[PDB]
Amino acid sequence: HKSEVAHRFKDLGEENFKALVLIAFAQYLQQCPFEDHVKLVNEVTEFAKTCVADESAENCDKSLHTLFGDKLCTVATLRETYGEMADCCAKQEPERNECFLQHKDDNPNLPRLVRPEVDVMCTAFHDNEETFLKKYLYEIARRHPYFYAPELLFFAKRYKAAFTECCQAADKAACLLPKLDELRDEGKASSAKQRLKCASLQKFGERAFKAWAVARLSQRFPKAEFAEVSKLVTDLTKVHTECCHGDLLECADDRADLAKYICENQDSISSKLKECCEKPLLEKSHCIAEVENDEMPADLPSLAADFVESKDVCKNYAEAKDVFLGMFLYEYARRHPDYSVVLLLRLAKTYETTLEKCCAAADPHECYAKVFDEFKPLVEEPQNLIKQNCELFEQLGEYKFQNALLVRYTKKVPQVSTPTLVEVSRNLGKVGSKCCKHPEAKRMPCAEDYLSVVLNQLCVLHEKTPVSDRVTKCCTESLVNRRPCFSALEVDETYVPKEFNAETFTFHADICTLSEKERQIKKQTALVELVKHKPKATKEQLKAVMDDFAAFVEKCCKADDKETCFAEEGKKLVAASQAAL
Numbered sequence: 001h002k003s004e005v006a007h008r009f010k011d012l013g014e015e016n017f018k019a020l021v022l023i024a025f026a027q028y029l030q031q032c033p034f035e036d037h038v039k040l041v042n043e044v045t046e047f048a049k050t051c052v053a054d055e056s057a058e059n060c061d062k063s064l065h066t067l068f069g070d071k072l073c074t075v076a077t078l079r080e081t082y083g084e085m086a087d088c089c090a091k092q093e094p095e096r097n098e099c100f101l102q103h104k105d106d107n108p109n110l111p112r113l114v115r116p117e118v119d120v121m122c123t124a125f126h127d128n129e130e131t132f133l134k135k136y137l138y139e140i141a142r143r144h145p146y147f148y149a150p151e152l153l154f155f156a157k158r159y160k161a162a163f164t165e166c167c168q169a170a171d172k173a174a175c176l177l178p179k180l181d182e183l184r185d186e187g188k189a190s191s192a193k194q195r196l197k198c199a200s201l202q203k204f205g206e207r208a209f210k211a212w213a214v215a216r217l218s219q220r221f222p223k224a225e226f227a228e229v230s231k232l233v234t235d236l237t238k239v240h241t242e243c244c245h246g247d248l249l250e251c252a253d254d255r256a257d258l259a260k261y262i263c264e265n266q267d268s269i270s271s272k273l274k275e276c277c278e279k280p281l282l283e284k285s286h287c288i289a290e291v292e293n294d295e296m297p298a299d300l301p302s303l304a305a306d307f308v309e310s311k312d313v314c315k316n317y318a319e320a321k322d323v324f325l326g327m328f329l330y331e332y333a334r335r336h337p338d339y340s341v342v343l344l345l346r347l348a349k350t351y352e353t354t355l356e357k358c359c360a361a362a363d364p365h366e367c368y369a370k371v372f373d374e375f376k377p378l379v380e381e382p383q384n385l386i387k388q389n390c391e392l393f394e395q396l397g398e399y400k401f402q403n404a405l406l407v408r409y410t411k412k413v414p415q416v417s418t419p420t421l422v423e424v425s426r427n428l429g430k431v432g433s434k435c436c437k438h439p440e441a442k443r444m445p446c447a448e449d450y451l452s453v454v455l456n457q458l459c460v461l462h463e464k465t466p467v468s469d470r471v472t473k474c475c476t477e478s479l480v481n482r483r484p485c486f487s488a489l490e491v492d493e494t495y496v497p498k499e500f501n502a503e504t505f506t507f508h509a510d511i512c513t514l515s516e517k518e519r520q521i522k523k524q525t526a527l528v529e530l531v532k533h534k535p536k537a538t539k540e541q542l543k544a545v546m547d548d549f550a551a552f553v554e555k556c557c558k559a560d561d562k563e564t565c566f567a568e569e570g571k572k573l574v575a576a577s578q579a580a581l
């Protein structure tokens with residue numbers, strides 16, 4: 001293209017162009033104030049307008065990396081605010097762009113964004129929809145300089161949807177805050193999810209990533225030929241490789257190219273893409289990333305003929321080990337959208353170990369002709385765990401199910417800080433709430449999707465402050481054994497009971513005057529501490545004081561006097577509890 005900026009401006013449109021320019025600059029100049037970014041956007045935007053009017057116009061033939069880097073090196077305060085980053089301006093492309101890339105600062109030190117009151121928010125939204133919305137877009141991008149820009153744009157449009165609706169409703173806050181809590185959860189999860197793929201790719205290498213992609217792409221497009229899945233796995237591996245490196249434009253072009261290939265070859269891939277493929281370039285690769293699985297072809301054969309009977313197993317394996325294993329993964333995954341990806345990786349690795357053991361032995365076929373028996377226990381384990389836990393979740397509430405998780409995980413690893421124990425148990429409990437309302441045909445992918453983002457981010461929090469050798473051993477091992485390792489943790493019988501502290505189990509009337517959530521957290525915080533102080537307490541014994549405490553609060557949080565019921569009756573509850581434990 002004669003002018004890449006004019007071309008982008010025509011592909012995306014003025015509104016999307018401006019928003020992505022803002023995110024781009026907010027992710028590099030993370031301490032410049034919001035109003036100078038607006039100046040940069042308006043300046044880049046009306047320059048781009050000269051380029052769509054005339055592509056021979058001055059500077060319109062420069063590359064976007066050049067144009068972007070040029071804009072960065074005109075910030076007058078660049079060396080005084082970003083210091084060493086300003087020295088990038090003395091290099092030339094592509095060294096300069098790489099130098100700027102290196103100087104992206106993850107985890108900068110900005111105050112946390114405090115959600116204001118609903119009436120404050122709706123009033124700001126009404127008084128200046130754009131400035132309000134773009135300011136929050138800027139606040140989030142500067143605090144997440146590696147969050148892929150278009151997805152951030154796609155979250156911004158969903159926030160706009162939440163405000164327009166709820167700022168008009170009768171009970172504003174009742175409409176808005178759940179939507180805002182929901183959006184925060186996904187954006188935080190997506191941020192965690194991107195950094196996990198990009199950190200297992202280097203921890204574990206291209207091969208393991210390719211193995212994961214074959215499984216995932218085969219469940220999604222089970223009518224595609226394995227040659228087509230392998231083509232897609234290759235392009236997709238390059239795409240995540242390049243996107244992990246951090247160049248937003250080089251990353252965006254790889255994604256857009258892959259989506260153009262997929263949309264051009266739908267009838268070799270899937271019948272579900274005609275709408276996504278009709279969508280504009282900015283949304284094309286996103287839409288297809290989250291499209292639902294295509295229907296499996298009717299009455300596929302068993303995997304027996306190709307992978308256990310056929311005399312050419314060991315010979316076809318040796319001819320190309322990974323391609324043969326990759327074919328096995330393809331055939332198993334396409335038949336099993338109900339499995340998690342990691343389970344399919346367990347099976348494939350299981351098939352790999354026995355093929356490696358039997359293809360070197362006398363009469364291989366005898367040695368390995370039963371390996372499909374080895375798959376059954378590996379399949380029951382995730383399913384069993386889902387059943388019992390989804391069963392328990394509908395026996396108890398969401399909140400009481402959290403309290404069940406709370407007791408169990410505290411007993412397994414009582415060294416974890418109380419607040420971290422509460423947050424994980426509350427979150428896991430949320431995962432029963434959404435995943436357990438799926439049928440068994442789609443429960444295991446649901447759990448995997450959510451556990452993975454609860455598991456390694458408790459592991460990144462654990463590498464921050466290690467407290468147990470067993471949770472580092474879980475967290476530093478394969479992503480296929482991550483969830484089993486944690487499931488295999490047993491009640492810590494090394495632990496020394498925490499010394500009784502009276503202030504930890506003293507309660508006041510403020511507890512009546514707190515929100516349901518904030519009341520549950522403090523109820524759940526005391527429960528962790530109770531299990532830490534008397535860890536040999538049984539759930540029968542624990543239920544008895546939990547019932548007592550429940551009655552205690554409902555008594556003192558309703559009497560004529562309150563501040564004194566909580567100390568007088570409170571003193572009784574404690575003493576009666578210590579006696580029973």
Ligand SMILES: CCCCCCCCCCCCCCCC(=O)O
Pocket residue numbers: 008020021024044064065067068071150248249252255256257259281282283284285286
């Ligand atoms: C002057 C600064 C350089 C130009 C700034 C352009 C901002 C980046 C363009 C984003 C392209 C988005 C393409 C979406 C397609 C996809 O993700 O598959």
Ligand SMILES: CCCCCCCCCCCCCCCC(=O)O
Pocket residue numbers: 204207208209210211214230233322323325326327329345346348349352478479480
């Ligand atoms: C078919 C194209 C890609 C070929 C490369 C993928 C071969 C699959 C290998 C499966 C090995 C076991 C599964 C991964 C386990 C792990 O990474 O810990």
Ligand SMILES: CCCCCCCCCCCCCCCC(=O)O
Pocket residue numbers: 340342343382385386389390428429431432435436443444447448451483484
């Ligand atoms: C879906 C229920 C989850 C309830 C809260 C989490 C605690 C139990 C999780 C058990 C299910 C594990 C399945 C993960 C998939 C896999 O690792 O193959």
Ligand SMILES: CCCCCCCCCCCCCCCC(=O)O
Pocket residue numbers: 385409412413416420424458459461462471483486487488
């Ligand atoms: C910072 C370290 C915190 C670790 C605290 C232990 C919490 C373990 C919960 C992880 C999920 C376990 C696997 C699924 C359910 C199970 O089988 O227990």
Ligand SMILES: CCCCCCCCCCCCCCCC(=O)O
Pocket residue numbers: 403505523524526527530533534545546547549550573574575577578581
């Ligand atoms: C053993 C010495 C201290 C005395 C014990 C008092 C603190 C008990 C722990 C509170 C658990 C509250 C959770 C149950 C109530 C509910 O779910 O609403």
Ligand SMILES: Oc1ccc(Cl)c2cccnc12
Pocket residue numbers: 140144152155183184186187188191
């Ligand atoms: O930390 C975050 C990452 C991504 C997104 Cl979209 C967020 C939205 C609101 C608050 N925090 C967020």
Ligand SMILES: [Cl-]
Pocket residue numbers: 113184
């Ligand atoms: Cl936040």
Ligand SMILES: [Cl-]
Pocket residue numbers: 114115116180
């Ligand atoms: Cl907010």
Ligand SMILES: [Cl-]
Pocket residue numbers: 124131132133135136
């Ligand atoms: Cl604002």
Ligand SMILES: [Cl-]
Pocket residue numbers: 135
């Ligand atoms: Cl604000």
Ligand SMILES: [Cl-]
Pocket residue numbers: 132135136139
């Ligand atoms: Cl804001």
Ligand SMILES: [Cl-]
Pocket residue numbers: 113139140143
């Ligand atoms: Cl944030």
Ligand SMILES: [Cl-]
Pocket residue numbers: 184187188
């Ligand atoms: Cl967040």
Ligand SMILES: [Ru+3]
Pocket residue numbers: 132135136
């Ligand atoms: Ru704001």
Ligand SMILES: [Ru+3]
Pocket residue numbers: 188
């Ligand atoms: Ru955030």
